[PDB]
Amino acid sequence: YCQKWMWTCDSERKCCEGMVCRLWCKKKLW
Numbered sequence: 228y229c230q231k232w233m234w235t236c237d238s239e240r241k242c243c244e245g246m247v248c249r250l251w252c253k254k255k256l257w
């Protein structure tokens with residue numbers, strides 16, 4: 228599916244909508 232808030236993330240395991248990968252998924256400001 229996609230990686231949720233604070234889940235690990237990488238090139239293939241992308242963060243869910245509204246988040247950005249910084250090793251773990253973080254909320255985007257925009």
Ligand SMILES: [Cl-]
Pocket residue numbers: 253254
């Ligand atoms: Cl955050």
Ligand SMILES: [Cl-]
Pocket residue numbers: 247254255256257
């Ligand atoms: Cl950000």
